[PDB]
Amino acid sequence: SGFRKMAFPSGKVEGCMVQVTCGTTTLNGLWLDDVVYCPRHVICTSEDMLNPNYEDLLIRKSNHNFLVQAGNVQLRVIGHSMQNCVLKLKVDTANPKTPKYKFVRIQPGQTFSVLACYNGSPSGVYQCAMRPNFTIKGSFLNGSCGSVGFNIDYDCVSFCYMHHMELPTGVHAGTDLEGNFYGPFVDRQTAQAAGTDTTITVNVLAWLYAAVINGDRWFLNRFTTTLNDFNLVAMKYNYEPLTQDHVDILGPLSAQTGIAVLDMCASLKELLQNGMNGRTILGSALLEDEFTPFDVVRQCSG
Amino acid sequence: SGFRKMAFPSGKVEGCMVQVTCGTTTLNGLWLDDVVYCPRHVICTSEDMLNPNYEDLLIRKSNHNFLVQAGNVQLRVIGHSMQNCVLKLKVDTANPKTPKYKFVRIQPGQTFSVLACYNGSPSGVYQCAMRPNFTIKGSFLNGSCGSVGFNIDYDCVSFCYMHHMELPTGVHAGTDLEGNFYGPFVDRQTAQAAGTDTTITVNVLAWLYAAVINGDRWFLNRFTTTLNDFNLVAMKYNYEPLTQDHVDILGPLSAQTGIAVLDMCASLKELLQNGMNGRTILGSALLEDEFTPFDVVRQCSG
Ligand SMILES: *[C@H](O)[C@H](C[C@@H]1CCNC1=O)NC(=O)[C@H](CC(C)C)NC(=O)OCc1ccc2ccccc2c1
Ligand SMILES: *[C@H](O)[C@H](C[C@@H]1CCNC1=O)NC(=O)[C@H](CC(C)C)NC(=O)OCc1ccc2ccccc2c1
Ligand SMILES: [Mg+2]
Ligand SMILES: [Mg+2]
């Protein structure tokens, strides 16, 4: 028993992190087989940051402008190219620690593990949700660009996020591994803001099931509501509408606890309208929305 | 910016996890050089669990009673011995992935990363504090015994915890790597309870400094208190007394924010007496005590 924010073990990804230096800018790259992936803004200078023309900047570069360091071993760049917002540096050595992997673009509300790195060197691991406004609430300092987010399935690493920038509210933005930003953001140092966010309803419900599996029942009640009347409440408290796909995805959790989805919705409704009145749920005084139903099943086997 | 519960990267420890089977009981072992470390209760049977005599059980065992599996490769046990509550199995192959490591016994209030494993296979990573009552608030199912807690310093893995059992309140108990339990617990299936816990005061203060470093200032006030008057408040709200050693350990955080320790104490005092009134601190509606001052410095460099 117990329920913690849990990341995937990060060894398979640690073996892929390298340092990429271009001029005076150094950040992290991802070394898979014989290609290094990193944010293209490594080729920017401090004045180009306002509105750079990347095709121009890259035409002006040569393979020897890129210093790639894997541990101590300096890697030789033999080719370079740009795909959307990521730079691909072909190197002469295939990474012998390359895991089985996939690139995947995730949907809002999905979670992943972040391996925060500095100078090619892993610093820490933590769990993140892709917010409905396509930001993540990360922990990133200068030098962290190129850190990646990932899920692990059996032995296969699914990379879903590469870190590019911090927004004025302190949240974070980046791309999939093919270099397409999540959300409307762009990789230049301008005034970009996160749009208003919403709470991930299906995840809150998953986490309430995790509470029931772990002995927290004080919020349960006898009432069951309808999908329509629940969505009326969700709108009022800035929650995502609940869909039949979400109800269905919560099936296994519903069946393991014997609490129908729309039964749990009437508890959430009461929790939204009355607060917690000093009580807690899984050690939290707020309703938590960064656990997917998959996350709960994975950690709550028994 | 940002502040997350952050574990150490776990690759160095993943390379050491093995499966240990004895009869019908299987749990995890830690493979360092040519020795495997695991909880001694792997040699118990379902009836011996009430009050076993381990010296008797172990005398009755032979090297071939122990099946050690590293991935697919079965490892050959060439010797076995007992040190307090851990079993040491000498194997014929030294672990080629053995990191630089140390065994350390930590003090209450210190944190460490847990690599939860099942059948020798890492499942997830998370962060824990050793509570003042010598339990941890973990996430552990059956089969997780033998999972270890650790800190990483430069390249050196410091192992501080091995998992043995769950208590009736759902919290968790175990040993250092030399097999000495944290707290008064013993490794038999009897009625053992955690004593009453207390809040780790120096960690709450560290986390309030993390809040200030990250822009949360609504709880600050002009007042400064004395160590004596603050400790009076701490007693009333079940907080650990604040020592001069703790004040001194908070030095760097105090100097980076320009807020003297006893200035921050008067904010904590006001927060204890008035609650938060609907506001949050670093995304929490409660005062958090599982971040050491070292944890904050590590993550808040800027
Ligand atoms: C890449 O390493 C860096 C990651 C930022 C830096 C602070 N926290 C982060 O996540 N990304 C950038 O510097 C990015 C550059 C692109 C051309 C967009 N710009 C950016 O994030 O600007 C915002 C920002 C906020 C705080 C700091 C603090 C210290 C240094 C730089 C910044 C930049
Ligand atoms: C070792 O793998 C196991 C870890 C426990 C099991 C459930 N969560 C844990 O952390 N440890 C034990 O089974 C331990 C045996 C020793 C002889 C003390 N006993 C124990 O924890 O008893 C309490 C307990 C609570 C819940 C469950 C659920 C399912 C199976 C066993 C238990 C045991
Ligand atoms: Mg109900
Ligand atoms: Mg003050």
Side-chain angles (χ1 to χ4, degrees), chain A residues 118-188:
Chain A
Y118 299 92
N119 309 118
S121 289
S123 181
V125 199
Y126 58 87
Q127 201 63 7
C128 275
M130 177 64 64
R131 309 298 315 173
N133 68 1
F134 291 104
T135 61
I136 66 185
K137 290 193 166 57
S139 176
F140 287 117
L141 309 173
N142 202 6
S144 63
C145 290
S147 306
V148 301
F150 65 92
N151 285 290
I152 296 189
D153 178 72
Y154 281 67
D155 75 305
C156 180
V157 180
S158 281
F159 296 101
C160 59
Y161 180 83
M162 175 169 270
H163 181 49
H164 290 246
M165 60 184 208
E166 183 167 303
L167 297 178
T169 52
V171 297
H172 295 104
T175 65
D176 59 25
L177 270 288
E178 301 183 334
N180 306 114
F181 266 94
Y182 292 97
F185 309 111
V186 300
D187 54 344
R188 41 188 184 260

Side-chain angles (χ1 to χ4, degrees), chain A residues 1-12 14 115-116 122-129 136-141 166 169-172 280 283-286 288 290 298-302, chain B residues 1-12 14 115-116 122-129 136-141 166 169-172 280 283-286 288 290 298-302:
Chain A
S1 97
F3 200 79
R4 278 270 202 204
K5 197 147 265 177
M6 197 169 302
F8 285 103
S10 68
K12 288 191 171 55
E14 291 171 49
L115 183 67
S123 181
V125 199
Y126 58 87
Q127 201 63 7
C128 275
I136 66 185
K137 290 193 166 57
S139 176
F140 287 117
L141 309 173
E166 183 167 303
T169 52
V171 297
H172 295 104
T280 57
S284 180
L286 304 169
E288 299 287 338
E290 303 216 342
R298 176 188 150 212
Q299 187 171 165
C300 302
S301 302
Chain B
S1 97
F3 200 79
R4 278 270 202 204
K5 197 147 265 177
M6 197 169 302
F8 285 103
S10 68
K12 288 191 171 55
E14 291 171 49
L115 183 67
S123 181
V125 199
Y126 58 87
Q127 201 63 7
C128 275
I136 66 185
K137 290 193 166 57
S139 176
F140 287 117
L141 309 173
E166 183 167 303
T169 52
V171 297
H172 295 104
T280 57
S284 180
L286 304 169
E288 299 287 338
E290 303 216 342
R298 176 188 150 212
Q299 187 171 165
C300 302
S301 302

Side-chain angles (χ1 to χ4, degrees), chain A residues 157-223:
Chain A
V157 180
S158 281
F159 296 101
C160 59
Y161 180 83
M162 175 169 270
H163 181 49
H164 290 246
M165 60 184 208
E166 183 167 303
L167 297 178
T169 52
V171 297
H172 295 104
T175 65
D176 59 25
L177 270 288
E178 301 183 334
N180 306 114
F181 266 94
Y182 292 97
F185 309 111
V186 300
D187 54 344
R188 41 188 184 260
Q189 276 243 213
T190 62
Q192 299 172 77
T196 61
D197 204 18
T198 61
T199 291
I200 306 153
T201 303
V202 69
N203 288 2
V204 172
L205 287 163
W207 170 83
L208 293 178
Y209 281 107
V212 176
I213 293 166
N214 277 270
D216 271 323
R217 306 175 66 84
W218 60 261
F219 53 86
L220 296 183
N221 63 39
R222 57 199 163 91
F223 300 86

